[PDB]
Amino acid sequence: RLFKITALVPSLSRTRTQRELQNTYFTKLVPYENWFREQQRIQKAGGKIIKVELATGKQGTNAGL
Amino acid sequence: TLDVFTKVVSQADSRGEFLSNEQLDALANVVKEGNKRLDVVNRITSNASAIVTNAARALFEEQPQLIAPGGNAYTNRRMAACLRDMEIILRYVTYAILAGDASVLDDRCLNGLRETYQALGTPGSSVAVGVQKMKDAAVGIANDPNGITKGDCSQLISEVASYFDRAAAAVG
Amino acid sequence: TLDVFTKVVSQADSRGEFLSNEQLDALANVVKEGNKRLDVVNRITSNASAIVTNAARALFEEQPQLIAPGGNAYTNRRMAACLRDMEIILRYVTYAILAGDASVLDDRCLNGLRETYQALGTPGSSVAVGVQKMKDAAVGIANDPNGITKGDCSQLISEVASYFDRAAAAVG
Amino acid sequence: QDAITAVINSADVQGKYLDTAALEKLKAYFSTGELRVRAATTISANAAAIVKEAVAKSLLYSDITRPGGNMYTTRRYAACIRDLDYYLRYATYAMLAGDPSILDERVLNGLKETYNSLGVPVGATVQAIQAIKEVTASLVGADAGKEMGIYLDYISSGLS
Amino acid sequence: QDAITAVINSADVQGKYLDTAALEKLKAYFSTGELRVRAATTISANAAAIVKEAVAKSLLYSDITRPGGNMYTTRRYAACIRDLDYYLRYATYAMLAGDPSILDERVLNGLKETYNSLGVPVGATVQAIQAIKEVTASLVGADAGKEMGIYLDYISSGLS
Amino acid sequence: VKTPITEAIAAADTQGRFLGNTELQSARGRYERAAASLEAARGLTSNAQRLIDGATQAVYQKFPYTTQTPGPQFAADSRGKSKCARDVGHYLRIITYSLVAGGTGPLDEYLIAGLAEINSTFDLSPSWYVEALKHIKANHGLSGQAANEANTYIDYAINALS
Amino acid sequence: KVIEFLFRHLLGRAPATQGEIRQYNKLLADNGLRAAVEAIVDSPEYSRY
Amino acid sequence: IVTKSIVNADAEARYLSPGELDRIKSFVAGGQQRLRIAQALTDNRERLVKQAGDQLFQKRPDVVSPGGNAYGQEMTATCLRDLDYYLRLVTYGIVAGDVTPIEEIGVIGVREMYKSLGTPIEAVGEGVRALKNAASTLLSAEDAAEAGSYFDYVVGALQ
Amino acid sequence: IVTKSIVNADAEARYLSPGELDRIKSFVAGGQQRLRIAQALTDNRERLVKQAGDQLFQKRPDVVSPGGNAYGQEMTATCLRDLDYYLRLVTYGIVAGDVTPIEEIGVIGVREMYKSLGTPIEAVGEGVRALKNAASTLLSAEDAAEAGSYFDYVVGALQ
Amino acid sequence: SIPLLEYKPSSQNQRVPGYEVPNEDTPRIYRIEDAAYDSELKELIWATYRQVFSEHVILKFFRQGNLESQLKNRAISVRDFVRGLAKSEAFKTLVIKSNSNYRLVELALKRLLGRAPYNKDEEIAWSIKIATNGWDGFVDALLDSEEYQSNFGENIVPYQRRRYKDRPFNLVTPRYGNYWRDKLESERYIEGDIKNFLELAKSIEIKTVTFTP
């Protein structure tokens, strides 16, 4: 139900003067429904995905998630 | 060793649900055709030894090289192996007719016959002819009405022709 | 059937020399830990039937399809196979703990278990899981001190956890 | 997940339908669900008094509420009240579901690492959860009290 | 990245310009790019029929599509269709680039951990990708079929 | 399995002889017995829900401690009572199996083989299912010759429990 | 108007052109407001702006 | 109805409402009748599925036409298995009181699935409507209103 | 191709690229041949539409079956009009070089439309494939590659 | 009647003398005439169950009350007692329904004679006798064989003769065969299949009309 993600996304636009440490490197909990498109956004931005982990869910659950 | 009844039982057993009414109705029909099943099984074992010798002569004419020297059924000892073992098809066929199922036929008389011949040198082709020469005479013995009441058993005699065809095609 | 002693004997027989001094120093340590070996083995057989039923319920919950119909352990005869049998792992494990060697465990309870299941249809993995549910309870039964003198046997209990892991990994 | 959805999921992994064993489990769940509803009302009555009595019995006048403790600061005390309150609310939810997996997936997912990283003591939380268990067992009743205590002890065992 | 940008990056790490060896690689890439365009059209024609024939050849009427399998549920079946549709689309992109690094960076970054965490079987996906490879090799042609199969086998080797 | 058709078959197999009139008369005896036994099975399959509800409640009122005593073996929790209707729901299948098969084959192969073997281990008292079957014996509601046919297999299971 | 409220609360800009209102009508109608909110936070303009 | 009430009170910060606790009490009170309806539908699995499928082929002969999807014994067996699956999900929804078991097992992604299978959606829907009519004829009257309204959810959600 | 290049350089902050200006120059250079292909397809409107529709009814007789949608003279006339519309959009896409005229006139919401009309999508797609085959036989060879690849976009986008 | 099929014997651990003087891992091969007690006969009656059935199928329901009583009385010789277990229809349903004829040779040699079969051609050799003589007649010819009566003798429980490094036979051979297992997978009752709906799909009548234009 909840994924534990950890990914880096570099800056391929112009360089930013704000620190932006979190954007470059983050670890966040994403729900299962949003995770496909949110991954696809990191897929688009050319960033590496380091660590994917199921936080809450169990594999192979047919009912009740 | 399975029946028509225990066929339905072991099929309903896996599901874990009690047998349906429709299935039961079908088994009530097997009770009604139960007396015709004893008509057909009693007619074969009465003509058992007469149909072994009669199918043997028609086999050993039409393949003369068997009792000719060098043949697989040449000497008097092997010849009795073949002649008397033609009962063992009929022993396990009339078991399956009275059972109404081909489970007893499969694990005794069918499970290793096509196995045992490569080590034995008995030709596979010869077996197909011999049992198939039993089938047209065993059906013809149970077909004709003489001193029995007339009925219809074409849906039941086709089971017997299926049993020999199961016994024939599993070897040759 | 080999010991820790006859392990050293048959190894020293192959080289054909006398028994060295440190081997007798090592076997003198087995004499000192000999009384700790007796207590652990004795404890298991006192809790033998209690750990068979307790590991069975934890197995048949977490794989419910076994005692469900169609499963390999569905019927009682089969079920009294998978349940009583679970003693036979423990029969040959506590032999090996009192022997101190895995030779008796190997040629009786390990030599054909991964063999016999392909012809049987029993699931090897499920059996392996069951033995791994024995191991964390058999170690936990011998671990706790209640009415015995306190000692240290972590170098000896690890032999027992190795024996179940030898019994588990040889099948699944 | 409920007890009903747990029964349905167990039968679905088997691939069969709901026959008499699962039906008897469902009848059992319905019979206890009546008193479960009554206990949910009587717990939602005075949840604040339950948390107040629990912290007054267990956490107050100790070293952790003194200067040099985890509950010294006013924001830390409010986080303790909220945390204690959450354990009561999710134990109520797990009581009404008849199933602790929703409770586990909700809080016991990450609360171990959170209390590890923040330096929150575990055993004081276990004592506070036990005090909640005693207060709710005294307030509600015997059998609904132990039904509440099963999931509260599940929380306390998951944190430990 | 392309084959062109790969050639440029290799020459840039060397620090030299594009002389005759790199130019001959570029002429080779142009000569195969014609049939690559024709194969992209004939793949984008009937991608749905390719995925349909692949799942009908490989995944249907098995234990995973039966109750008690990974593809039993309707949302799981739709996720399977969209994953095979992806593998075909990204193998088309990697065919037109002439370079598998964009394909690797796109999907093989995290699909291993995702199929690990969700419990998705790997070998059934490898069989499905092989069925896609056979269907596209029968549909497109010989040399463009094996050009497609190189990147499809790259996907199947990256998942394994 | 054991069936008086196959009882006639396996007896003629060991002697190595054909199906004479000795084995043949055992068949009809099974055949006309089914017509008083198949609607004896229809009386149980139609009343399936009634009896497993009736026998389970009859056990609790006979043994009132089995609902209160804490243990896995007992019916204190919900999963005990869920396993309660599974067990007596499993008994009524085999009785309908052994009525339809016409012999004690399915009672032998599926229920009573190792039945005294498991009850020593899981401390399930067999007198629990004795009172369970005796409620089914009195509440079946069957009448006539067919009823008598459904009455023996209930009593054949009771003597196997004891 | 819900769509302009969404673009204003999450971003502060609210509509740019009629066509994005068109493309958000379908996202509202298929599942509800939550799918359209997730489509707003999926959009690359949120990450740039 | 417990899961839906809990997640609805989860979206808010508050507990379960007295109204919702009345809903759970009424659901418990009607649960035994719902188990009786599930008992009848479990035991009538065969003939309900066959009558509904044959009513479908009476209404829609396009599927069993040789240009259609359900042409042949194996294809029509899978057709009847699909109707069996949907009747099983209807029994789950009658027992639970929610439609979340019906939804997340068989509704949520079925359009894209039957688009990729080549199967028409409307014939599935007409078959489930035939199941609704058959199970309405089998059961008691307002009990059939209860069963047919879950069937009605499945029919309206498939189209 | 000018609109797509302009909106693509609009998403960035920069002007049109030299690569994109080469694309526009090559599109201008091929534009006269594209007008010739549009001339041939305009003048072959009748027989192309009729041959493609009759090839469709040879392949798929379900639509003109009496259970099907295109049963009757008026329904089959609207079928041929739909094929006429799609051939017109294919000519627009051949002229423009983009597929944005094909898309925003006839692709973008066609699945929901033909779902609500009761019409199968795959038979539309098979008819446009028949149009592709017919217009491929009429034109010059690599000119037919050009026409059939826009037809290929329409076919793949309908399914 | 007819003499048996002539079979070549292979090299086997018991066929020859071996100079093991009593090794420990060798069985305790029991005798009836030692007993003189209540006590000894309960262990002896258990080891013959452990041989012929197997440990797993040694449950109380299968066991025969009449046979056990006879051994204590001593009316029947242990060699006459093993005939009870081999011709027991409680034994016969467990092994003859589930095993083919050639496996029935091998299982009887492996347990009763306590020896491995020599070759394949001798299970073929014993096979003809079983079909004609029945299961009881083949067992009767095995126990009255000269090989069985000389080596086990008259009152000694079956056991494996020589196993220097050889598998125990109970472990080595399953009660049932590899064939009968494949039937159990075939009648598993798969769930959610198209095959169980095939007999229902042919009963439904479907009429299709095609229009050509």
Ligand SMILES: *[C@H](C)[C@H]1/C(=C/c2[nH]c(/C=C3N=C(/C=C4\NC(=O)C(CC)=C4C)C(C)=C\3CCC(=O)O)c(CCC(=O)O)c2C)NC(=O)[C@@H]1C
């Ligand atoms: C007959 C049409 C052909 C034929 C028969 C034949 N067979 C043998 C030898 C054997 N036959 C069997 C057959 C069975 N054994 C079984 O257990 C069963 C099922 C119950 C069957 C059908 C076996 C095992 C043998 C091996 C020896 C034996 O009798 O025990 C012979 C004798 C051959 C010989 O002695 O070398 C013969 C003549 N052979 C033919 O020529 C016919 C074509």
Ligand SMILES: CCC1=C(C)/C(=C/C2=NC(=C\c3[nH]c(/C=C4\NC(=O)[C@H](C)[C@H]4CC)c(C)c3CCC(=O)O)/C(CCC(=O)O)=C2C)NC1=O
């Ligand atoms: C405000 C606190 C803070 C810091 C310091 C910070 C650093 C930071 N440096 C980065 C990259 C980088 N950092 C460097 C730095 C160097 N290269 C060298 O050879 C030198 C050793 C060193 C320069 C002195 C380079 C070259 C990159 C880009 C590498 C790439 O192309 O991916 C990135 C990745 C995204 C990016 O900016 O491109 C972050 C987040 N972020 C923060 O929030």
Ligand SMILES: CCC1=C(C)/C(=C/C2=NC(=C\c3[nH]c(/C=C4\NC(=O)[C@H](C)[C@H]4CC)c(C)c3CCC(=O)O)/C(CCC(=O)O)=C2C)NC1=O
């Ligand atoms: C076990 C001892 C036993 C036997 C043998 C037996 C046979 C038997 N066969 C019968 C009928 C019959 N049997 C047959 C059989 C056939 N007619 C044909 O033309 C076919 C070729 C053939 C089947 C292949 C028929 C047609 C009837 C008519 C009556 C009926 O349906 O039973 C009946 C009805 C009652 C009667 O005849 O008095 C009896 C008794 N009943 C017994 O108790």
Ligand SMILES: CCC1=C(C)/C(=C/C2=NC(=C\c3[nH]c(/C=C4\NC(=O)[C@H](C)[C@H]4CC)c(C)c3CCC(=O)O)/C(CCC(=O)O)=C2C)NC1=O
């Ligand atoms: C001394 C070493 C030794 C072992 C361990 C051994 C096992 C063994 N277990 C067997 C059967 C069996 N084994 C099991 C056990 C299981 N099946 C299940 O469903 C469970 C998953 C699992 C237990 C956890 C069962 C139930 C049977 C009976 C199966 C049958 O009769 O077809 C059989 C074949 C029949 C038999 O004689 O009982 C052997 C040979 N034999 C040996 O000589």
Ligand SMILES: CCC1=C(C)/C(=C/C2=NC(=C\c3[nH]c(/C=C4\NC(=O)[C@H](C)[C@H]4CC)c(C)c3CCC(=O)O)/C(CCC(=O)O)=C2C)NC1=O
């Ligand atoms: C064959 C029958 C038999 C048994 C069972 C037996 C056990 C046994 N264990 C003993 C001691 C002992 N046994 C243990 C065992 C342990 N303590 C721990 O804390 C560990 C967890 C565990 C080992 C894993 C210890 C620590 C002692 C102390 C005395 C000694 O060293 O023997 C002794 C010393 C004498 C006595 O206790 O009266 C006996 C008798 N003796 C026998 O004749």
Ligand SMILES: CCC1=C(C)/C(=C/C2=NC(=C\c3[nH]c(/C=C4\NC(=O)[C@H](C)[C@H]4CC)c(C)c3CCC(=O)O)/C(CCC(=O)O)=C2C)NC1=O
């Ligand atoms: C574009 C590059 C890319 C890919 C490929 C991708 C895959 C991907 N597949 C997923 C799930 C899934 N993937 C499968 C796949 C399969 N099941 C099987 O048995 C087969 C072996 C295999 C189908 C051929 C299934 C069944 C799920 C859903 C499992 C669940 O219910 O949680 C998920 C989790 C969210 C979801 O879609 O439901 C992602 C992110 N994401 C991406 O960004």
Ligand SMILES: CCC1=C(C)/C(=C/C2=NC(=C\c3[nH]c(/C=C4\NC(=O)[C@H](C)[C@H]4CC)c(C)c3CCC(=O)O)/C(CCC(=O)O)=C2C)NC1=O
């Ligand atoms: C197919 C034929 C068949 C039947 C019927 C069968 C019953 C059976 N019931 C068991 C346990 C049980 N049986 C019951 C049933 C009851 N206990 C009670 O308190 C009630 C009085 C009663 C129900 C009315 C319960 C609650 C358990 C679990 C007990 C435990 O885990 O210790 C067990 C041992 C553990 C198991 O696998 O679940 C078996 C083998 N097994 C079979 O193979």
Ligand SMILES: CCC1=C(C)/C(=C/C2=NC(=C\c3[nH]c(/C=C4\NC(=O)[C@H](C)[C@H]4CC)c(C)c3CCC(=O)O)/C(CCC(=O)O)=C2C)NC1=O
């Ligand atoms: C529990 C939720 C669930 C559903 C609904 C489901 C459907 C389902 N239908 C299938 C095939 C099929 N489904 C149909 C269906 C139909 N024939 C028609 O024309 C009618 C409109 C419709 C009958 C309702 C046909 C004809 C096939 C065979 C198509 C093929 O084999 O390509 C298949 C692939 C083969 C299989 O695994 O059985 C699945 C998975 N699976 C599920 O797990």
Ligand SMILES: CCC1=C(C)/C(=C/C2=NC(=C\c3[nH]c(/C=C4\NC(=O)[C@H](C)[C@H]4CC)c(C)c3CCC(=O)O)/C(CCC(=O)O)=C2C)NC1=O
């Ligand atoms: C330019 C983009 C565009 C398209 C595509 C379009 C289609 C379109 N098709 C229609 C009907 C129809 N369309 C078909 C189509 C077909 N018969 C089949 O089976 C085949 C799969 C398919 C032929 C390709 C049929 C049979 C009808 C009549 C349905 C009715 O009258 O209800 C209608 C309603 C009546 C009308 O206004 O003509 C529209 C608007 N309109 C548009 O503006």
